[PDB]
Design a protein around this ligand. Structure first.
Ligand SMILES: CC(=O)N[C@H]1[C@H]([C@H](O)[C@H](O)CO)O[C@@](O)(C(=O)O)C[C@@H]1O
Ligand SMILES: *[C@@H]1O[C@H](CO)[C@@H](O)[C@H](O)[C@H]1NC(C)=O
Ligand SMILES: *[C@@H]1O[C@H](CO)[C@@H](O)[C@H](O)[C@H]1NC(C)=O
Ligand SMILES: *[C@@H]1O[C@H](CO)[C@@H](O)[C@H](O)[C@H]1NC(C)=O
Ligand SMILES: *[C@@H]1O[C@H](CO)[C@@H](O)[C@H](O)[C@H]1NC(C)=O
Ligand SMILES: *[C@@H]1O[C@H](CO)[C@@H](O)[C@H](O)[C@H]1NC(C)=O
Ligand SMILES: *[C@@H]1O[C@H](CO)[C@@H](O)[C@H](O)[C@H]1NC(C)=O
Ligand SMILES: OC[C@H]1O[C@@H](O)[C@H](O)[C@@H](O)[C@H]1O
Ligand SMILES: OC[C@H]1O[C@@H](O)[C@H](O)[C@@H](O)[C@H]1O
Ligand SMILES: OC[C@H]1O[C@@H](O)[C@H](O)[C@@H](O)[C@H]1O
Lengths: 316, 171, 171, 316, 171, 316
C-alpha cells in the first residue's frame, strides 16, 4: 500500500533554449518573433490617401497627376513608385526633408498669396505638363518677358502668413537649355532671383546650358522651399528665371506616411506598415522589414525565439 | 535544472496524466488511480500566464521614415542612418535572445519549484505515518482506501488516526 | 513564488513582529513569546542592501546638446536625431522595466529563501525530538522552558538531552 | 508545548510588479525613476556665465549685448531665449555647429589678426548696432569704398595662427538692399569675396536686392567661419561686400553648454541640467526632459518603477 | 546565497578534495576516505559549460566607418555621430555589466543547488537508518565498512539490510 | 561511524561581482572583456591593398602616388596618414561620402568616356604633378584655350553608362590665382561649367583670386562627383575652368575599408580592425578602440568583467 507524486509529459514536445542549454524539450511553448506579413495596407477605419501617380511633393506644385490632390486630407498617406513630383523636368531642392514634413501633415490646405503682374507674361506652358492640350503647374506661374528677348523689369512681391500655423512657400528657378535661350525667355545679363524671409535669406542665379532631353526636353525647373512662420513675411526679389507661387500650403494635422507597392484593404486594420504590407501582431519582436513604420514590434535578426510555457518534457 | 524534482529524483514523468500539470498516482485496496492537483496546476499556469501578458504587449511607440525606399537619400546621411539603425537591431537582437533564455530558465525552474512544494507538503501531512521511497513516492505504512487517499488529496488527512497503526506497522 | 515558505505553507505572517524580518513565536511553561532571528534578518537585509548600492549609481557619462530648443536645427538632421533618440528612449524604457521586475522576482524569492533555510536548520537541531506540524511549527514533544527555548534561539540546543524524554513522549 | 517560525508583515504595504505578476504587495519598496525637478540652474562651485541678452555666437562678432562677454571664461555656459547673435540683421552660416563648439570651449580668448587698410574706409556703422549713438560689431570692421560709388581696390590680407591651439576666424558678406545700393557702398560689377585657408578653400559673391525690414533695415550681413589650425594661414581675397575680422578667437578649455529659462542658484550643486532646471538624483532613471544634458540618469517613459526592498506582505 | 548548502549549514568546504566539485568524506572501520561524486560534479560543469558556449560567441554583424580618424568630418554630423555612438556604448556597458552579475548570481546559486540535491538524495537512500547531524553529515547508526560506504556512493544501498540494526541502535 | 557531504575550494580564488554583492570569492572565473590588441593588420587569406601614399579618392583622379592603384582590386583596403588624394592643390567636394563608397567597393575598374577635343588644348601640366618631369592627373585632362588669352569655344560632351552597374564620374573646377590669370588660361567673362546628369543637375563657376601657396602654388583645383546610373547619360556643358574626365570608374564588389598606422601581417587572420591593429577574440565585449570596424566584439567602458565558472570558495 503506497502513494506517488509526479508531473505531466507528452509524446513529443517543443525544443527551446535556456540560459544553460541549447534545445531542452518542453511541453507547450510559443513563438515570440512575428514572421507573418499581410500583403496589403490594412487601412480599416483610417482616412487614407493613395497618391498613385502623384508624388508627395507634387501636392504643393500641382502637376497634372497631382490634380485630384492639391488639398488632400488624411490619416495615412501612401506613396507609390509610379508617382512623380514633376512634369517639366527638374527637381526639388532639399527634397526628402519636405516629404518627411508632408507625410506627417495630415494633409494640406491651400491659400493664394495674391501676386498679380505688371509688364510681363503670367502663363508660360509646356508640352510636358499636359491638361487640355499643353499646360503647367497649377499652383505656380511661369513668369516670362513680354515678347521675345524683351525686358524682364526687376520685381519684388511679398506674402504675409496671416494664419497661426506655419506655411510652405515654394518657387522654381529655370535653367534654360542655353545663354542664348535664357534671353529668348527673360532677357540678358546676371539673372538674380533673391529670397528673403526673415529667419532665412538667400539667392538663386540660373545656370543655363546643355543637358540631355528628359520627357524630350533639355531644360530644367528645380523648386526650392521655406517654412514661413505665423506673422512673418517672405519677399521675392527677381529679374528672370523665376517660377512664381500662386499658393502657399498649410498643414492640416497628423498623419502616417508610408511607401508601398501593395494594395489597400479596408477589411483588416493595422498600425505596422511597410512596403510589403502590414504587420499585425502582439509579439514583442518582428523579423520582417527593419524599416517598418507605424507602431511596430521590434526588428530582430532572429527568425524564431521560442518561449516556454510548460515544464520539462520527460517520458521513458 | 535546480530544485531536484522534475527530471531528477522523480524519475521521468507521466504521459498518462491529462487533467493538469501535477498529480498523485496511488495503489491500495482497489488498485491504481490518478487525479491531478488543481492548486499546484493552477499556481504554475497563473505564473506563466503573467509572463505572457507582459511580453505579449502593445508598444505605442511610433516611428516614421527617416529614410527612402524609392529615391534613396544623400549618401552621407544614408550611411549614418544604417549605422545607427544596425547599431540598434544589434541591441534588440541581444536583448530579445537573452530575455527569452532568462525567462525559459525561470519558466522551467519555476515548474520544478511547484513540484518540490507539493512532495514536501504531503510529507508534512503524513507526519511519522510513512517514508521517502527514493523516487517521489511515500510508503503509507498502513492501508489507505479510496476515501483515505481522498483525505490526503483535499488536505484533511489527520495523521493522529493512522499514527497508532503505522507506529508498529513501520517495524 | 518559489521555495514554499513566505505566503505558502507558512500560512500568512506576523504584523506583531517588529524586531526584524524573521522570528520565533513559541508557547511553553509561561506562555507565548516572540523574538526575532537577527542572522536571518541581517542576511536578507545585507543582500537587498547590495542591490540598491548597484542600482543607486553615479553614471559619469556625460552628454551634451546636438539639438536646439530655441532656434530649431535643420529639418533633415533634426528628424534623424529624434529618431535616433527615440530609438534609444525605447531601449532604456525596456531595459528599466525588465531590470525592476527581474530584481523584484529575485528580491521576493530571495526572502522566501532565507525562511526555508531557517525552518530547515531548526529541524536539524531538533533531530528526532519534535515533528513538522504542517504550517511552519514544530511540536517539541517534551517541555522546553524560557531557557530551553533560548538554547534553540542561540544555536546551542543539544538534542541528546531531551532525546530520551521525547523517545517515549512521542508515542 | 510547541514552537513556530514565521516572518514579518504590515497593516498595508507597497504594490510592485514582478516578472510573473502585476502588483504584489511587499513590505518596503523604493522608487527607481526620478520625477522631482529643481527649477534653477544649480551652479554651486562652478565658474558660470549667464549670457542673457548675448547669443553664444555673439561672443565672436561682438554686438552691443555681447560686450561684457568678448573674452568670457567658464565651466558652465547658460544661453537665454532673450539672447541674440546679431545687431545688423543677418545670420551665421553653419550656425548650430559653431555653438556646439563654443558651448564646450570653456570660453574664448581673443587676439588681433593685424589688418590695416590702404585706400578704403575701415569703420562703417549702423543705427541698429548702438554704442555711444550708432556703432557696429566690436570684433569686426565694415570695409567700404572711400567715397560714394568709388573704387573698392581689390585686396588680399592674411593671418597666421601663431598658437598651438586652433583659432576661429569670422567674416561677413553684405547683402545690400539693391544692385544700385551695392554700388553706393563698394562700387559696381561681380563683387567677389574669396577665402583660402589651406584645409579649406571657397568663395562668396553678395546677392543684393529686396527683403523686408528687420530692426527697420532691409539689408543683411551674414557671417561665415572656419577653424584655422596651428601653423596654418588663412588668406582673404576681396573687392567689396566684406566685413573684416579684427580678431581671431581661441578656446580656453572645457565647458558644459545648456539652454534654460530658469535662474542660477549657487546654493544647490548639480550636474544634470535642462531648460526647466536641475535634476539632482542618484536614481538610474529620470522621467523629466529627454534632452537633459550633463551627467544624467537615463530618460525613460515610465513615470514610476517600484523596486522591492522587502518580502511578500501577507496578513490574515 | 539561496539554497543553504555552500557556505551555510555546510560549514565551509574542502581544499583537500581535488577529484571534482562535490564529494563524500566518511569515517568507519579503516578510517577517513574522500571520493568525488562525478554525476553532481558533471551536472554543474555541464551547466556552466552551456553558458560559456552562449557568451563566447561569433557576432557576424559587421560595421564600417561613418567617421574619419585622419581628416575629421564636418563638425555638425561629427557631433551627432559621437552622440549616437556614446548613447550606444552606454547601453552595452549597462547590458554587459548586468549580464555578468545576473549570470554570476545564477552560476553560484546553481552550485548551491546541485549540493542540496545530493545531501537530500542520500537522505532518501538512508530512510530511517541515520540522522541529520546539523552541518552536512549523517550519523549512520550502525557500522558501514568500505564496501557499505561504496553502496551509498554508487546508489545501490538497500536500507532494508541495516534497518533492523539501526531500529534499536538508534535508541 | 559517520558520513559527510561537501564541496571543493582552493587556497585563494578569483573575486567576481554578483547581483547582490561586490566581490565574492569563487573558484575558477573567466574574463569577458577583450583587452589584448595585436599591433598589425592581421590580413591572412585576404586580397589586401595598402594604399600608403595614395589617398583613396586618388584612385579615381590618378595622381603620381596613385599610379600603381588606378584599377586596384581588393577584400581589405588600408588607408594611410601619409596618403594623399591630390597633386595640384585643391580638394574633393563631398569628400568623405565618396570614401565610404570606395572603401566598400571591392576595388575599381576603369573605362574611357571617349571625349576628344576640337579647338583647345587637351594637356595642361603642373610642376606639382610630377611623372617624367612635370605632369598631371592620369584619369583627367587640363582643358585650356589654344593660346594665351584665346577663345575657350563653349563645349558640350556626354557619356552613357553602357554597363549594368553604376559609374563614378569625376571632374574639376580650376580656381586660378586671379581674374587676370583666369584669362591667361581660358579667356575672360562669366566662366560657367554646367553638369546635367538626369537624376541630378547643377552648375559650377570658378572663383579665382588670392590664396596662399600649397606645394608652392597659389591655385586650387577642386574635384566634384556623381553616381551615373545603368543606361543614363551625363552631359558636360562648359566654357573654361574645367578639368575633363578621361575615364569613368566602376565598382568591382565588396570590401572592408580601414584606416591604420600599423603594418600588414599575413600570418595572423582577423576580422576586427582598427587603427591600432587587430582584435582577435571570441569575447562578447572589447575595451579597445570604440571605432573598431569589421566584425567585432562590443565596445564597453569596463576594463574587466569577471564571469564565474565555479562555486563559492569557502576555506576555514
Ligand atoms: C599653363 C598651365 O596649364 N599651368 C601652369 C601653372 C598654372 O597656370 C597655375 O598654377 C594656375 O594658378 O603654373 C606652372 C606650374 O604648375 O609649374 C606652369 C603650368 O604649366
Ligand atoms: C500677428 O499679427 C497681427 C497684426 O494684425 C497681430 O494682431 C497678432 O496678434 C500677431 N500674432 C499672432 C501670434 O497671431
Ligand atoms: C541601407 O539599408 C538597405 C538594406 O536593405 C540598403 O538597400 C540601402 O541602400 C542601405 N544604404 C546604403 C547607402 O547602402
Ligand atoms: C524633435 O522633438 C522635439 C521635442 O518633443 C520637438 O518639439 C521637435 O520639433 C522634434 N522635431 C520635429 C521636426 O518634429
Ligand atoms: C609653427 O611654425 C614655426 C615657424 O617658426 C615652427 O618653428 C614650429 O615648429 C611650428 N609649431 C607649431 C606648434 O605649430
Ligand atoms: C569624436 O570622438 C573622437 C575621439 O574619441 C574625437 O577625437 C573627435 O574629434 C570627436 N569629435 C568631436 C567634435 O568631439
Ligand atoms: C540599357 O539600354 C539598352 C539600349 O541598347 C537597352 O536595350 C537595355 O534594356 C537598357 N537597360 C539595361 C539595364 O541593360
Ligand atoms: O516634345 C518634343 C517634340 O514634340 C513635337 O510635337 C514638337 O513639335 C517638337 O518641337 C518637339 O518639341
Ligand atoms: O532706423 C529706421 C529709420 O530711423 C530714422 O531715425 C532715420 O532717420 C531713418 O533714415 C530710418 O533709417
Ligand atoms: O617651386 C616653384 C618654382 O619652381 C621653379 O623651378 C620654377 O621655375 C618657378 O616658375 C616656380 O614654379
Amino acid at each position: 500500500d503506497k502513494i506517488c507524486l509526479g508531473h505531466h509529459a507528452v509524446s513529443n514536445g517543443t525544443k527551446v533554449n535556456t540560459l544553460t542549454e541549447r534545445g531542452v524539450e518542453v511541453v507547450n511553448a510559443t513563438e515570440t518573433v512575428e514572421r507573418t506579413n499581410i500583403p496589403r495596407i490594412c487601412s480599416k477605419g483610417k482616412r487614407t490617401v493613395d497618391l498613385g501617380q502623384c508624388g508627395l511633393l507634387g501636392t504643393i506644385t500641382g502637376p497634372p497627376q497631382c490634380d485630384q490632390f492639391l488639398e488632400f486630407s488624411a490619416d495615412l498617406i501612401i506613396e507609390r513608385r509610379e508617382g512623380s513630383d514633376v512634369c517639366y523636368p527638374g527637381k526639388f531642392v532639399n527634397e526628402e526633408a519636405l516629404r518627411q514634413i508632408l507625410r506627417e501633415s495630415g494633409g494640406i490646405d491651400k491659400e493664394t498669396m495674391g501676386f498679380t503682374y505688371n509688364g510681363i507674361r503670367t502663363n508660360g506652358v509646356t508640352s510636358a505638363c499636359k491638361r487640355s492640350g499643353s499646360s503647367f503647374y497649377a499652383e505656380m506661374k511661369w513668369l516670362l518677358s513680354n515678347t521675345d528677348n524683351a525686358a524682364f523689369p526687376q520685381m519684388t512681391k511679398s506674402y504675409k502668413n496671416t494664419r497661426k500655423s506655419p506655411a510652405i512657400i515654394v518657387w522654381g528657378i529655370h535653367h534654360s537649355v542655353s545663354t542664348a535661350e535664357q534671353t529668348k525667355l527673360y532677357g540678358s545679363g546676371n539673372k538674380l532671383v533673391t529670397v528673403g524671409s526673415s529667419n532665412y535669406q538667400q539667392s538663386f542665379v540660373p545656370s543655363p546650358g546643355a543637358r540631355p532631353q528628359v520627357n524630350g526636353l533639355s531644360g530644367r525647373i528645380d523648386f526650392h522651399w521655406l517654412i514661413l512662420n505665423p506673422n512673418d513675411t517672405v519677399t521675392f526679389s527677381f529679374n528672370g528665371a523665376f517660377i512664381a507661387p500662386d499658393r502657399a500650403s498649410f498643414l492640416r494635422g497628423k498623419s502616417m506616411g508610408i511607401q508601398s507597392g501593395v494594395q489597400v484593404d479596408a477589411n483588416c486594420e493595422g498600425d505596422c506598415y511597410h512596403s510589403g504590407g502590414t504587420i499585425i501582431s502582439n509579439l514583442p519582436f518582428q523579423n520582417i522589414d527593419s524599416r517598418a513604420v507605424g507602431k511596430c514590434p521590434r526588428y530582430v535578426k532572429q527568425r524564431s525565439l521560442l518561449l516556454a510555457t510548460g515544464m520539462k518534457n520527460v517520458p521513458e | 535544472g535546480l530544485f531536484g524534482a522534475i527530471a531528477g529524483f522523480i524519475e521521468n514523468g507521466w504521459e498518462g496524466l491529462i487533467d493538469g500539470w501535477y498529480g498523485f498516482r496511488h495503489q491500495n485496496a482497489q488498485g491504481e488511480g490518478t487525479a491531478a492537483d488543481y492548486k499546484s496546476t493552477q499556481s504554475a499556469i497563473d505564473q506563466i500566464t503573467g509572463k505572457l501578458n507582459r511580453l505579449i504587449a502593445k508598444t505605442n511607440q511610433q516611428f516614421e521614415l527617416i529614410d527612402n525606399e524609392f529615391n534613396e537619400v544623400e549618401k552621407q546621411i544614408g550611411n549614418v542612418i544604417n549605422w545607427t539603425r544596425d547599431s540598434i537591431t544589434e541591441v534588440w537582437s541581444y536583448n530579445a535572445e537573452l530575455l527569452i533564455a532568462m525567462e525559459n530558465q525561470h519558466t522551467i525552474d519555476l515548474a520544478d519549484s511547484e513540484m518540490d512544494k507539493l512532495y514536501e507538503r504531503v510529507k508534512r501531512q503524513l507526519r511519522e505515518n510513512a517514508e521517502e521511497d527514493g523516487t517521489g513516492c511515500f510508503e503509507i505504512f498502513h492501508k489507505c482506501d479510496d476515501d483515505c487517499m481522498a483525505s490526503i488529496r483535499n488536505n484533511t488527512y489527520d495523521h493522529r488516526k493512522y499514527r497508532e497503526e503505522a507506529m508498529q506497522n513501520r517495524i
